[PDB]
Design an enzyme around this catalytic site. Structure first.
Site, PDB file in Angstrom:
ATOM      1  N   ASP A  49     -38.977 -56.085 -45.481  1.00  0.00           N
ATOM      2  CA  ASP A  49     -38.575 -56.173 -44.087  1.00  0.00           C
ATOM      3  C   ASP A  49     -39.157 -55.009 -43.308  1.00  0.00           C
ATOM      4  O   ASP A  49     -38.715 -53.868 -43.453  1.00  0.00           O
ATOM      5  CB  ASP A  49     -37.054 -56.161 -43.952  1.00  0.00           C
ATOM      6  CG  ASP A  49     -36.592 -56.253 -42.507  1.00  0.00           C
ATOM      7  OD1 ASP A  49     -37.432 -56.463 -41.606  1.00  0.00           O
ATOM      8  OD2 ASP A  49     -35.379 -56.088 -42.269  1.00  0.00           O
ATOM      9  N   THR A  83     -41.555 -57.778 -37.567  1.00  0.00           N
ATOM     10  CA  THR A  83     -42.708 -57.270 -38.301  1.00  0.00           C
ATOM     11  C   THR A  83     -44.018 -57.714 -37.665  1.00  0.00           C
ATOM     12  O   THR A  83     -44.968 -56.927 -37.573  1.00  0.00           O
ATOM     13  CB  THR A  83     -42.631 -57.733 -39.754  1.00  0.00           C
ATOM     14  OG1 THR A  83     -41.458 -57.187 -40.368  1.00  0.00           O
ATOM     15  CG2 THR A  83     -43.859 -57.292 -40.523  1.00  0.00           C
TER      16      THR A  83
END
Lengths: 517, 514, 509, 57, 65
Positions: A49, A83
């Site tokens: 993550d 991201t």
């Protein structure tokens, strides 16, 4: 300290913002690769993550901090996309390099990427813009709460994680108000549960339970006595704090608080509220009395929580044992300690079928990161869901929009005679990292993998079919249920291009070096 | 000991000290004029497109760098604009006399001749200067929107200036009579939408504290009596450190329930002060708000002093040293209070401020990092819209006159010289470098563009200029790119002496050494 | 100081003194100077074309320069200009003899050549004295008279300062005919313009001035460095912080404490109680309620300023002032001085001997520049009180002596012959100190000044007419030196250089 | 060099038309062209990068 | 320890004797000059007196005794 400008400050900006994207693009998607990340604290954190990476990331190069920021923006509203905006930055960043290497001016470059991003977010609008109600949305929500909870590692075997979210934003905030309350949704989680253990609570679950279960474990509807009053020492701010060592004062004290706490507890029984929640709660001596009084009541309470017990229940506030009146009674639908089948997990749900002002989405799991995995699952799921429960506007992911966006942008770049005709077309270029890293996350050769989608978008001209996002062999987006809020890509894009654009607008660096904090 | 140095090694170091600094602001100041992230401390990282701020932020290691700060800063206080360019002009001659200094050739008239040279412009600047106010409309608040449009368009959004420029006018009106950032003080919002703002001409509160229920606690007053309070009410109030012994016996409940009560007094003295909307820079407490939400008089805690001050200037009110509010002017007061969420955040808005001279703006941007650049358009426009108010005489913006002057001046390089055609030529050209930088920090060409202007400056046209966005020849005042004459006037006179000052200095004494 | 040796101090340290001393005149002396940045141990930019200042602003690393630095200072003492002279002139003296050494001419020998010539100078000096002008009540005659000295030491406004500076010294003693070394204590106040600088008199406290004026006419003060912060020796001022109740209680006693305070001063009588110390709240508002004038945060300077004019002594203790400790002024009043509101006392018929010229500008350097200039004007006033003699400005005066001094050297001979003609060269550096400050060459000028050939009106000043060297009439130009100042100037420079010429190198244990 | 400046522009989107791993190839292949008269443009002075942006269009 | 012998024991004696003595010949008679010795005080002493400069500051020598 030193002034750094131009290509100097350029390659200053270039390093980490490019370099940081790499671990995150290797972490891109579920096929994105995990990263064990260990503190100087002895800690160990395995994270694919990037939002968690950026959080885990203390690394230098202030830009590398600004991504820790920028993911969190899209993290709450859009959910997923934390991201990608980062890895898209380094894409259009290095993409920006050779235009200056070409001699395309630092403010020539940014704006070519910027307006071309308009076309992108504009072209994004062509995928699916739909809007539906919660109970319809749940199907595109859970199909995405597939991806979200799943890109968060095991949506699997859960619509429990999926469909309490359908309620979560729904109950705390309206569909049309679109005012972000994940603040009103209480995302609560407990180790020792199960990922298969997930719960919606429209009210507040207070972990503190009845002083004794010998006292009634069910208090009736409401009749909660809001009490900020000591039944144990209330960390009272005035005096020097000392316990007594002598049997003389040992006896003189023990008769003292047996009188008050009982008549306090009886005064609670007198206020007509058969649950006493006490912001300064219960030690055992008051509880024997409380047990002897046969009054169901609550032990130590967090200070703001008895307030959160007020709002979330619509509970009318009884401030203090001095203010006591029988009229104001806190709201609880039913007061009981909840063991879910997980008995180590015991909270007292204050469960509001009448006034619920804080919706607790309570998820469980075996361990810390597990529930955390499940929390950031349940977090961004709902967060992506919140878009789709409000405006269910879906782009199908994995580079299927990228080509689709890169297509229109590219030609329209050439259509613009402005110098950015290159930059706008150079813009459409770096979009391809999105299927690229994902291809290599999915373990595929992107350069071919992506132009599949191109050949698709050459034909399809829409995300529907695509490549494998889940590495499943069916190269699809719609059909692979790769379903991404069409808001978020517009979000994600605008986040990347403009952050970089100021990074591009800021060529003037006073630092002792290239990068700094 | 003591340090000192003289002459060309010092004197060139005197001019060497300066030219280093003017490059900090070099490519800055504009839409394609660059922007400076300047990190002068480890966790201290600062961003400005203005010199004066970073001048304040940066270290000055030279008398030059020292002598420079005010010179640019001199143009700061004036328009709110133009430090960077004054910094450019100050050392812009310094490279031209480096022929002379490396000739070793310096009669001091070089600085003394640039002065009448500085005179012929600031004179000519105001000559061509034209009042926009009585000239434009009969109205002169669409004139301001023209200025607002043009002055919302020179850094960031021209998209929203069509909407914003009318409000920039409205802000300036309530800004004018007291010229303040706090009273145009903006409250950023995000997530309710992207990229928009709206003027709210009463005050607004970004902050407040309410618990023990909120949706059950009154959030609005259609006649707020506004307590502007710095007071604090915590979990329990204490006038004593300790006396006797947490447990003992009589002593336990004795402290606690009174520790409750010492709050109640301040809890009361707020509420019977005529504080219904209650505002305390220091937070209201939880049990206080348990009390405050029990008393159903809207409290606030963690309150901005500016919010407290924006009100006291908009209400004619006052921040209060006492929870008791005797005077409605020591108090704040309005005919409207609301807690309404624009974007979803709790806000305390005051309309009905009797003065209401504080305009607030509720502003949304595109992203996290895109938002700053937007409101500086709003902030700049006002400053220069007000600047268009202050000096109504206004010329073409964007360095339109310099090329003309650059011609007009070294026209004397034909007219002046027994000698100083050099000085008059060198004086004439340094004008152009500021927009040429703006031309060049646009990555675009100036000698191309500016000379084309000059070809029509050879026509005699002066307001002929560049629109820094398009970056091509034009007439700035016909594009209505605007600055009053005095803007151009000072920047010269500011940087002129700066160029003159240390050139009288071949020598610097340091007693502390180095 | 110097363990160093090898025939150094003479051939070497002496010219380095001149090095240090030159350009601190030669571009700093004339109708103007050219700025010299200085940063003291107090770190700030100090522009000084004044010889005395920049010298003292530098710290002497020589025994050599150490000597003649005072010869330039004593000029500012004795004159108020010709200090840059001693820089250049005495700097132009010995570097000549640097040849004589390699010419093979001794020290004790060639000194004589320099020695006798100052007399010959002092003997020529009365000749080129050109008319004279004195009225100590003239601002105008003194304005042009203060011009030459401020010019050298000021690049700022020559004429308007000459109007201000020849105002005060003439205005503070309207009579004059008796003039104080300090007859003007300027009240330096930043803000507005250097033109907003104006001429007031008596004493001024730019310091915080509080209470209220109960007499603008009567000015009575007991000057104190004593804090009214609760410092008094009548009772015992005692501040009790041990408990907050104690803090509150003494503040109550502070009202009656200050009732023992500014009362006791105006018990002797007072209007301003001059406070070099501090005043706390209950004391301030009391004295505000007591309605005595409190000028607050008075520093030692305004004290040292005011301590002299009234004849009262600043007391760090608070007592009722004795006759000695209570000052009176003509009038104490609040006037914006150069248009900034501060209290301004009055001493003129008080015996005066303090004028307050508000020195102004938007920077200290504006207030500091004229600060360099005004004293030269204050200085030449006494130089006027001493002799009425006008001798024209520098650079015209030197050529006439030199030509004679050269022909004197021609009548001199014996190996000091040219050692006298060396002294004849020390002259031309002064117009060169103007010509260099101007940027043209004195050889031309010397050519011209011996072309035009007459001596004492013919000089080039700092000019834009100095593009081509262009001579102006110094006596006529409004640039007016005096006999003394020149006679002072020649003296010390001739004094200090020939004796540092007599030095040897230092042996050290 | 216009023949490039037309064709390079062409082949790019025709390279794009290819898709496949190779569609990138003919673009950079085509892209290679118009830098040639660019230098030639700069060989005549001025700004090809400005010009070749435009002549392309 | 170190012993200086013979003409070596003689040299620095007469060497530090005559040379420092030769240092002082700027003086002695009105045709002599003053001689500058700055003591530890930083004092400027320009003197033609021989008695003076001996004790004040003199380069270290056994002969200086």
């Amino acid at each position: 300290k030193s002034r750094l400008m131009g290509l100097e400050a350029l390659k200053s900006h270039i390093m980490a913002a490019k370099a940081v994207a790499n671990t995150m693009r290797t972490s891109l998607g579920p096929n994105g690769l995990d990263k064990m990340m260990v503190d100087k604290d002895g800690d160990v954190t395995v994270t694919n993550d990037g939002a968690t990476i950026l959080s885990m990331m203390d690394v230098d190069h202030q830009i590398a901090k600004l991504m820790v920021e920028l993911s969190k923006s899209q993290d709450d509203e859009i959910g997923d996309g934390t991201t990608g905006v980062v890895v898209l930055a380094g894409a259009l960043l290095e993409e920006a390099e050779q235009l200056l290497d070409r001699g395309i001016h630092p403010i020539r470059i940014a704006d070519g990427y910027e307006q071309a991003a308009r076309v992108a977010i504009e072209h994004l609008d062509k995928i699916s813009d739909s809007v539906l109600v919660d109970i319809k949305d749940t199907e595109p929500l859970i199909q995405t709460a597939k991806t979200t909870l799943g890109s968060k590692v095991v949506n699997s075997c859960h619509r429990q994680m999926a469909e309490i979210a359908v309620n979560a934003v729904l109950t705390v905030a309206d569909m049309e108000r679109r005012d972000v309350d994940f603040e009103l949704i209480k995302v609560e989680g407990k180790v020792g549960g199960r990922l298969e253990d997930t719960k919606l609570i429209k009210g507040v679950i207070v972990d503190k339970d009845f002083s004794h279960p010998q006292m009634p474990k069910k208090v009736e509807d409401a009749k909660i006595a809001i009490l900020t009053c000591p039944f144990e020492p209330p960390k009272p701010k005035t005096k020097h704090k000392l316990d007594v060592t002598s049997v003389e004062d040992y006896k003189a004290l023990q008769k003292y608080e047996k009188e008050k706490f009982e008549e306090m507890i009886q005064q609670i029984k007198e206020t007509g509220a058969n649950l006493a929640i006490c912001q300064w709660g219960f030690d055992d001596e008051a509880n024997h009395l409380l047990l002897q009084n046969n009054l169901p009541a609550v032990r130590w309470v967090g200070g703001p929580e008895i307030e959160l017990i007020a709002i979330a229940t619509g509970g009318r506030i009884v401030p203090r044992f001095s203010e006591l009146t029988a009229e104001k009674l806190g709201f609880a639908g039913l007061v009981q300690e909840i063991s879910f089948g997980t008995t180590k997990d015991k909270m007292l749900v204050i469960e509001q079928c009448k006034n619920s002002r804080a919706v607790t989405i309570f998820i469980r799991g075996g361990n810390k990161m597990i529930i955390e995995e499940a929390k950031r699952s349940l977090h961004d799921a709902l967060c992506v869901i919140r878009n789709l429960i409000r405006d269910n506007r879906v782009v199908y992911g994995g580079g299927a929009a990228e080509i689709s966006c890169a297509l229109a942008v590219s030609q329209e770049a050439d259509k613009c005679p402005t110098l950015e005709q290159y930059a706008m077309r150079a813009f459409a270029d770096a979009l391809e990292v999105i299927p690229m890293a994902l291809s290599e996350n999915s373990g595929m050769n992107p350069i071919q993998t992506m132009t599949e989608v191109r050949a698709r978008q050459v034909k399809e001209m829409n995300p529907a079919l695509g490549i494998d996002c889940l590495h499943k062999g069916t190269n699809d987006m719609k059909q692979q249920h790769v379903i991404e809020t069409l808001i978020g890509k517009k979000q994600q894009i605008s986040l990347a291009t403009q952050m970089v654009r100021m990074i591009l607008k800021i060529d003037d660096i006073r630092k002792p070096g290239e990068s700094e904090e | 000991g003591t340090d000192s140095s003289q002459g060309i090694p010092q004197l060139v170091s005197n001019i060497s000290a300066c030219q280093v600094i003017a490059e900090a602001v070099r490519t800055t100041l504009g839409p394609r004029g660059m922007d400076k992230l300047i990190v002068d401390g480890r966790g201290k990282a600062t961003i400005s497109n203005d010199g004066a701020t970073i001048l304040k932020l940066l270290d000055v290691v030279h008398p030059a760098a020292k002598t420079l700060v005010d010179i640019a800063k001199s143009q700061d206080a004036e328009v709110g604009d133009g430090t960077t360019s004054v910094t450019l002009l100050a050392a812009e001659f310094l490279k031209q006399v480096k022929p002379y200094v490396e000739e070793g050739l310096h009669p001091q008239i070089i600085i003394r001749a640039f002065r009448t040279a500085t005179q012929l412009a600031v004179n000519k600047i105001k000559e061509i200067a034209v009042t926009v106010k009585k000239a434009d409309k009969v109205e002169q608040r669409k004139l301001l929107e023209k200025c607002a449009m043009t002055a919302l368009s020179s850094k960031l959004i021209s998209q929203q200036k069509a909407f914003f420029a009318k409000m920039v006018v409205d802000a300036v009106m309530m800004l004018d009579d007291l010229l303040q950032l706090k009273m145009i003080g903006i409250k950023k919002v995000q997530g309710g939408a992207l990229e928009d703002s709206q003027l709210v001409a009463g005050v607004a509160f970004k902050k407040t504290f309410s618990y023990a229920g909120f949706e059950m606690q009154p959030k609005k007053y259609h006649n707020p009596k506004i307590a502007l309070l710095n007071v604090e009410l915590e979990l329990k109030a204490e006038k004593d450190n300790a006396e006797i012994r947490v447990h003992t016996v009589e002593d336990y409940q004795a402290i606690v329930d009174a520790e409750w009560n010492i709050l109640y007094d301040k809890l009361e003295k707020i509420h019977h002060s005529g504080a219904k909307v209650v505002l305390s820079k220091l937070p209201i407490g939880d049990v206080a708000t348990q009390y405050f939400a029990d008393r159903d008089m809207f409290c606030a805690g963690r309150v901005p002093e500016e919010d407290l001050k924006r009100t006291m200037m908009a209400c004619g009110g006052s921040i209060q040293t006492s929870v008791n509010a005797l005077s409605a002017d020591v108090l704040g007061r309005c005919q409207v209070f609301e807690e309404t969420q624009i974007g979803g955040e709790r806000y305390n808005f005051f309309t009905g401020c009797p003065k209401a001279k504080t305009c607030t703006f509720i502003l949304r941007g595109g992203a996290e990092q895109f938002m700053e650049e937007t409101e500086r358009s709003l902030h700049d426009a006002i400053m220069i819209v007000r600047r268009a108010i202050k000096n109504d005489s206004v010329v073409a913006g964007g360095g339109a006159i310099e090329m003309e002057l650059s011609k007009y001046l070294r026209d004397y390089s034909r007219t002046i010289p027994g000698k100083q055609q050099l000085l008059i030529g060198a004086y004439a050209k340094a004008l152009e470098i500021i927009p040429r930088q703006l031309c060049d920090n646009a990555g675009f060409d100036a000698t191309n563009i500016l000379n084309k202007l000059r070809a029509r400056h050879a026509q005699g046209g002066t307001w002929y200029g560049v629109d820094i966005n398009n970056e091509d020849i034009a007439d700035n005042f016909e594009a209505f790119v605007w600055e009053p004459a005095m803007v151009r006037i000072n920047a010269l006179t500011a940087a002129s002496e700066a160029a003159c000052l240390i050139v009288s200095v071949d020598e610097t004494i340091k007693n502390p050494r180095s | 100081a110097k363990h160093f040796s090898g025939l150094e101090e003479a051939v070497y340290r002496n010219i380095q003194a001149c090095k240090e001393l030159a350009q601190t005149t030669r571009t700093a002396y004339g109708p103007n100077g050219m700025n010299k940045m200085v940063i003291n141990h107090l770190e700030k930019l100090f522009v000084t074309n004044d010889a005395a200042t920049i010298l003292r602003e530098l710290e002497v690393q020589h025994p050599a320069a150490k000597m003649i630095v005072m010869a330039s200072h004593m000029q500012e003492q004795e004159v108020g200009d010709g200090t840059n002279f001693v820089l250049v002139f005495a700097g132009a003296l010995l570097e000549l003899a640097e040849e004589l050494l390699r010419i093979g001419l001794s020290v004790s020998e060639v000194i004589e050549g320099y020695e006798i010539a100052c007399r010959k100078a002092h003997e020529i000096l009365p000749n080129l004295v050109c008319c004279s002008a004195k009225n100590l009540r003239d601002i105008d005659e003194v304005s042009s008279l203060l011009r030459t000295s401020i010019m050298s030491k000021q690049y700022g406004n020559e004429v308007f300062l000459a109007k201000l500076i020849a105002q005060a010294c003439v205005s503070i003693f309207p009579d004059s005919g008796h003039f104080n070394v300090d007859n003007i204590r300027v009240c330096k106040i930043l803000g507005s313009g250097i033109s907003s600088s104006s001429v007031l008199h008596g004493m001024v406290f730019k310091k915080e001035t509080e209470g209220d004026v109960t007499s603008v006419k009567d000015a009575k003060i007991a000057v104190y460095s004593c804090p009214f912060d609760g410092m008094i020796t009548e009772t015992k001022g005692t501040v009790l912080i041990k408990t907050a109740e104690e803090l509150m209680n003494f503040s109550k006693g502070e009202e009656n404490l200050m009732d023992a305070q500014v009362k006791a001063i105006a018990d002797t009588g007072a209007n301003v109680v001059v406070t070099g110390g501090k005043v706390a709240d209950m004391a301030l508002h009391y004295a505000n309620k007591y309605n005595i004038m409190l000028v607050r945060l008075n520093s030692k300077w305004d004290l040292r300023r005011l301590c002299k004019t009234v004849g009262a002594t600043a007391l760090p203790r608070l007592t009722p002032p004795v006759l000695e400790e209570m000052g009176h002024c003509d009038s104490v009043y609040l006037s914006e001085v150069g248009d900034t509101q501060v209290v301004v006392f009055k001493h003129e018929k008080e015996d005066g001997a303090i004028s307050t010229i508000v020195l102004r500008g938007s920077t200290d350097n504006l207030m500091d520049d004229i600060e360099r200039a005004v004293d030269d004007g204050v200085n030449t006033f006494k130089v006027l009180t001493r002799d009425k003699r006008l001798v024209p400005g520098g650079g015209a005066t030197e050529i006439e002596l030199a030509k004679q001094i050269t022909s004197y050297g021609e009548t001199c001979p014996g190996l000091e012959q040219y050692a006298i003609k060396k002294f004849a060269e020390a002259f031309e550096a002064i117009p060169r100190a103007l010509a260099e400050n101007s940027g043209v060459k004195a050889n031309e000028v010397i050519s011209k000044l011996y072309a035009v050939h007459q001596e004492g009106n013919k000089n080039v000043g700092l000019d834009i007419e100095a593009e081509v060297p262009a001579v102006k009439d110094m006596l006529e130009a409004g640039i007016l030196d005096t006999y003394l100042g020149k006679y002072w100037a020649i003296k010390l420079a001739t004094n200090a250089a020939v004796t540092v010429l007599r030095v040897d190198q230092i042996i050290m244990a | 060099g216009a023949p490039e400046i037309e064709l390079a522009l062409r082949l790019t989107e025709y390279s794009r038309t290819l898709s496949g791993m190779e569609s990138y190839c003919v673009r950079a292949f085509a892209d290679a062209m118009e830098v040639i008269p660019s230098t030639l443009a700069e060989n005549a002075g001025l700004n090809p990068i400005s010009t070749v942006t435009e002549l392309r269009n | 320890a170190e012993v200086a012998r013979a003409q070596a024991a003689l040299a620095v004696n007469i060497s530090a004797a005559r040379g420092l003595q030769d240092v002082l010949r700027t003086n002695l008679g009105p045709k002599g000059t003053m001689k500058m010795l700055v003591s530890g005080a930083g004092d400027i002493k320009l003197t033609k007196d021989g008695n003076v400069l001996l004790h004040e500051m003199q380069i270290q020598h056994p002969t200086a005794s």
